[PDB]
Amino acid sequence: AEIYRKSAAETFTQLEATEVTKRQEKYGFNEDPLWKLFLETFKDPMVIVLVIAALVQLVLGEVVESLIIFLVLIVNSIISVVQTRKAESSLDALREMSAPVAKVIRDGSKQSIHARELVPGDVVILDAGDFVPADGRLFESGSLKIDEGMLTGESEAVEKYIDTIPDEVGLGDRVNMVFSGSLVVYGRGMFVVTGTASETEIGKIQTPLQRKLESFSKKLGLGILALCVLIFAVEAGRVLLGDNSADMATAILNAFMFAVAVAVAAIPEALSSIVTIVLAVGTNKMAKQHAIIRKLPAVETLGSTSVICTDKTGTLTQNKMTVVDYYLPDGTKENFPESPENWSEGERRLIHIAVLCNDSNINSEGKELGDPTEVALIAFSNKNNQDYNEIREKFIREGEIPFDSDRKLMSTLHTFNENKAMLTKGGPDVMFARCSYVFLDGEEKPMTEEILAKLKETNEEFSNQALRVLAYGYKRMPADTTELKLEDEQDIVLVGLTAMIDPPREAVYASIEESKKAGIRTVMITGDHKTTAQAIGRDIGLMDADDIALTGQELDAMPEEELDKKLEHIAVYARVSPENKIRIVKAWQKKGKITAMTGDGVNDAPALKQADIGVAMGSGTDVAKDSAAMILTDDNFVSIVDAVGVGRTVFDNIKKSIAYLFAGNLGAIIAILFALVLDWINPFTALQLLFINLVNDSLPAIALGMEKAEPDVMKRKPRDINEGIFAGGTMRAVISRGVLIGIAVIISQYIGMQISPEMSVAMAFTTLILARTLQTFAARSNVQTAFGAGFFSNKYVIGAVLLCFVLYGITVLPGAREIFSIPASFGLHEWSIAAGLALAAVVMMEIIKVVQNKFFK
Ligand SMILES: [Ca+2]
């Protein structure tokens, strides 16, 4: 768009890149009807077969049944699209608060607007992992590794430079602009946005559980339709009256009505509705649990996470350390808070290097900006003997090493008292192998075996206390103001060692224990010294007895054949790498064991992609979130355990709701079949069965899918990788539930047979519908009873039960008894027998549940 040929200053002049609202309304902002969705949601095969049944039931000129079935379709359609609109609003909220925020320099005004409210002509800084939202010209960048797999499918990391492209335009390998829709793999993206999202080049361009459940629905539909074909054949050939069959031409309509109503009852039309509704409410629960899930198909498998590979920093640690103990080569206890003066030479040297190498500062109280280790060190300095940060401003910062990932020598040089003071921090072992002088008062003499042994002794002593520890050095040549380079890095003295405790977040111990009780083996990666992380894991609670831990160096130097054997008994990885992250996530995925990675860094994205349910931290980079199936806003590990608990609750809601629906439908089916085998009038007419399918297979099933967490969700083994909807325990529950309720309907039909066939039909219908509405109570869980869990504890269930009771209260009205095949008027006993049978059914059902709690497991 005429920006390819311009250089940096030419883009500044031509596009007026440096009122901001004027440019926003002038250049433009850089950001499906619901009835159309309702029209397009008829793809459900259950909805298709029910709508063809509704249209044929309309074409025989019968009105009330047609309105009943049509009402079933519209209520499930409107509840599906209403919860779909709720999911759309939730997704818009997730895209709003977790929007990619680009740090904007603008006209020198350092702030950070979101992606939608950007405007061309303002400077934007892109750090590593800061996904660039809008295309724009770049002037300087240091090795800006930019991949373009989404903008144009360019998998290569193109390094944008100062060079422009005059008299040529091409979206391929070009360096002139950093286009939108691109991820900063590495580099510093100091560029100016030149494009509205409309003019950006990228702007110009169901779940596996859902698929398995639709396959199960199609199998059940074929079987059920075969069953109704058999039922229609029974009504046809079993009796057929005599040879003349009276008026069989005008009497096949009622038999086809019975078979069709059997199809409507048995078919779970609200299957996909239940799944979508509980996925929406589960996602809302994850949002309540500080867990913004990105990939929608990841909700079902979150209940199946038999392993989670987390990291201690961020999740198992709220940052802001407090160093509790320290080592000095002279040797004493803590003496910093009391000491007004410099006190011992080791203490004062350690304090000055801790302050000087500290990149961060306390600033205003409660405001921490830098690295957590440096924030902790300056908070320690300011905690003991009051203010100590004021000493840094009277100390120049000449030579500062940029703290390379292979260096661990964050340096500092001052000219205030010492001329060329080589002041650096780093890891314990790296300084121990690098620094070569001991600090005993003014003596600066090299290491020996016993001295190095004592340093290592205090190092492992701090390590087994779960204390990460840093080493410091002072010794330097006089020389003069150097070029801030390494110079002489083999002659450094050893100042004392300060070991900082890594405190876990609140309720980390409880969540860890409840995850270990749930069979969810937890795995924690770290980058510090090994036995420090081992003691941290012992503190957390994932280390006991036979468990082992291996470093990253041993991780990448060991073939997978023995690592597979060792994998099940190891939870701590130290000095890990993203390649080792790929290794561990693939090894955990190999033996089933659904994995949830944790990487928040930029190059952790391959580990997040290969992870089944890899979660990126909210404080982490945006490219990891793109590579992640889900995000934690509060970044805590307790959010992961709450997330997998919510996933288990959602899958248990699937199991319980499908159990309720299939059990009631099977009870009706076996009632009809038992009336069929014994040469009996069928228990329910067409309109009665359609009204039962109206009352249930609906809002009560939705409410049963809205059931909260039973007290044993974190006490069970994780679900298998496959869906396993027809689990053996839940199949036993389904068959017992359906057989019992059908037994109640059969007994009611037999009692009604003692009076009249019409009384039998009416009593069987009311027994079935009352037993469905009251079995909604007993099917709230497979562990807790309706009274045990509390009736009002599930507000949706009791509200829906009252709703269906009111709706069934149409039957008692005399104006609807004719269409419902309810004859005459009741004194007491046309209702009392049915109510007693239904109450006995649900109480039998409940003591069966208690027996499974008491006798069985
Ligand atoms: Ca149904």
Q: Vertex 738, ends 735 and 742: CA angle to 5°? A: 135
- Specify the experimental method: cryo-EM
Is there a single domain that holds both residue 684 and residue 567? no
Task: Look at residue 26 and tell me if it is in a domain.
Answer: no
Helix (H, G, I), strand (E, B) or coil at 97: helix
d(CA 787, CA 792): 9
Measured CA distances, 783 to 693, 733, 856 (Å): 27, 11, 11
Domain end point (choices 608, 635, 662): 635
Query: In CATH, what number is assigned to the domain containing residue 310?
Result: 3.40.50.1000
Instruction: Please tell me whether 235 is known to bind a ligand.
Output: no
Domain end point (choices 635, 655, 690): 635
Is there a single domain that holds both residue 561 and residue 670? no
606-609 long-range CB contacts below 8 Å, 24 or more apart? 606/578, 606/582, 607/578, 607/581, 607/582
Query: In CATH, what number is assigned to the domain containing residue 143?
Result: 2.70.150.10
> DSSP labels for 413-466?
---SSSSS--EEEE-HHHHHHH--EEEETTEEE---HHHHHHHHHHHHHHHHTT
Task: Look at residue 106 and tell me if it is in a domain.
Answer: no
Q: Reduced to 3 DSSP states, what percent helix, strand and coil does the chain have, rounded to the nearest 5? A: 50, 10, 40
d(CA 744, CA 728): 24
d(CA 647, CA 175): 45
Per-residue tokens: 604: 């952790």
Task: Centre a 10 Å sphere on the Cβ of residue 252 and count the other Cβ atoms it contains.
Answer: 14
Task: Look at residue 110 and tell me if it is in a domain.
Answer: no
76: CB partners within 8 A, 6+ apart? 47, 269, 270, 273, 698
Helix (H, G, I), strand (E, B) or coil at 849: helix
Instruction: Please tell me whether 184 is known to bind a ligand.
Output: no
Instruction: Please tell me whether 390 is known to bind a ligand.
Output: no
Q: Dihedral of CA 289/295/297/301: which sign? A: negative
Is there a single domain that holds both residue 621 and residue 753? no
Q: Which domain holds residue 243?
A: 45-80+224-285+643-854
Is there a single domain that holds both residue 276 and residue 312? no
d(CA 85, CA 89): 6
What is the 3-class SS of 626-664, one letter each residue?
A: HHCCEEECCCCHHHHHHHHHHHHHHHHHHHHHHHHHHHH
Helix (H, G, I), strand (E, B) or coil at 795: helix
Is there a single domain that holds both residue 810 and residue 777? yes
Is there a single domain that holds both residue 654 and residue 525? no
Calculate how far, in angstroms, residue 270's C-alpha sits from the geometric centre of ligand 1.
Answer: 7
Calculate how far, in angstroms, residue 265's C-alpha sits from the geometric centre of ligand 1.
Answer: 4
Closest CA to 9 of 192, 188, 195: 192
Per-residue tokens: 311: 């990291």
Calculate how far, in angstroms, residue 36's C-alpha sits from the geometric centre of ligand 1.
Answer: 25
Is there a single domain that holds both residue 366 and residue 400? yes
Burial class, 242, CB count within 10 angstroms (exposed 0-12 / middle 13-18 / buried 19+): exposed
Name where the chain breaks: residue before each gap, C-N > 2.5 Å.
18, 31, 205
Widest distance between CA atoms in the chain:
123
Per-residue tokens: 342: 């410099």
Instruction: Please tell me whether 59 is known to bind a ligand.
Output: no
d(CA 316, CA 524): 9
Tokens 């768009």 belong to 1
Instruction: Please tell me whether 697 is known to bind a ligand.
Output: yes
d(CA 136, CA 16): 13
Helices (H), 299-371: 345-356
| Chain centroid to CA 361 | 35
Task: Centre a 10 Å sphere on the Cβ of residue 38 and count the other Cβ atoms it contains.
Answer: 16
Task: Centre a 10 Å sphere on the Cβ of residue 156 and count the other Cβ atoms it contains.
Answer: 12
User: Strand runs (DSSP E) across 34-132, as ranges?
Assistant: 102-106, 111-113, 122-126
Q: Residues, the chain, total?
A: 857
130: CB partners within 8 A, 6+ apart? 100, 102, 103, 184, 189, 621, 622
| Chain centroid to CA 20 | 38
Q: How many domains does the chain have?
A: 4
Q: What is the resolution of this structure in A?
A: 3.7
Please state the φ and ψ torsions of residue 440, each to the nearest 5 degrees: -120, 95
488-491 long-range CB contacts below 8 Å, 24 or more apart? 488/422, 489/409, 489/434, 490/434, 490/436, 491/436, 491/437
Is there a single domain that holds both residue 705 and residue 808? yes
810: CB partners within 8 A, 6+ apart? 816, 820
Domain end point (choices 591, 618, 635): 635
Is there a single domain that holds both residue 648 and residue 691? yes
Cross-strand pairs, 291: 632
Instruction: Please tell me whether 389 is known to bind a ligand.
Output: no
Calculate how far, in angstroms, residue 248's C-alpha sits from the geometric centre of ligand 1.
Answer: 29
Q: Dihedral of CA 653/655/658/659: which sign? A: negative
Measured CA distances, 330 to 301, 353, 602 (Å): 56, 17, 43
b (16+ CB within 10 A) / e for 805-833: eebbeebeeeeebebbbbbeeeeeebbeb
Task: Centre a 10 Å sphere on the Cβ of residue 437 and count the other Cβ atoms it contains.
Answer: 17
b (16+ CB within 10 A) / e for 26-36: ebeebeeeeee
Q: Give yes or no for a contact between 821 and 754, defined as CB atoms under 8 angstroms apart.
A: no
Task: Look at residue 783 and tell me if it is in a domain.
Answer: yes
31, amino acid identity: E
Helix (H, G, I), strand (E, B) or coil at 574: strand
Q: Give yes or no for a contact between 1 and 135, defined as CB atoms under 8 angstroms apart.
A: no
Calculate how far, in angstroms, residue 661's C-alpha sits from the geometric centre of ligand 1.
Answer: 8
Task: Look at residue 605 and tell me if it is in a domain.
Answer: yes
**182: DSSP letter:** B
Tokens 């053996």 belong to 728
CA-based Rg of the chain, rounded to a whole angstrom? 35
d(CA 614, CA 628): 5
Dihedral, CA of residue 24, residue 27, residue 28 and residue 30, to nearest 10: -80
Per-residue tokens: 357: 């190498």
d(CA 502, CA 42): 55
338, amino acid identity: E
Per-residue tokens: 799: 């509200």
Residues that are catalytic: 311
Cross-strand pairs, 124: 104, 191
Query: In CATH, what number is assigned to the domain containing residue 665?
Result: 1.20.1110.10
Tokens 């003997």 belong to 385
Closest CA to 498 of 680, 325, 731: 325
Task: Look at residue 454 and tell me if it is in a domain.
Answer: no
Task: Look at residue 99 and tell me if it is in a domain.
Answer: no
Per-residue tokens: 334: 């803590």
Measured CA distances, 656 to 185, 285, 346, 672, 856 (Å): 45, 18, 67, 24, 19
Q: Give yes or no for a contact between 613 and 630, defined as CB atoms under 8 angstroms apart.
A: yes
b (16+ CB within 10 A) / e for 373-401: bbbbbbbbbbebbeebbeebeebebbbbb
**132: DSSP letter:** B
Is there a single domain that holds both residue 155 and residue 190? yes
d(CA 173, CA 185): 16
Calculate how far, in angstroms, residue 768's C-alpha sits from the geometric centre of ligand 1.
Answer: 14
What kind and span of H or E run contains 185? strand 183-186
| Helix axes of 345-356 and 372-383: crossing angle, nearest 10 degrees | 140
Calculate how far, in angstroms, residue 697's C-alpha sits from the geometric centre of ligand 1.
Answer: 5
Is there a single domain that holds both residue 626 and residue 537? yes
Task: Look at residue 517 and tell me if it is in a domain.
Answer: yes
| Chain centroid to CA 595 | 12
Is there a single domain that holds both residue 582 and residue 603? yes
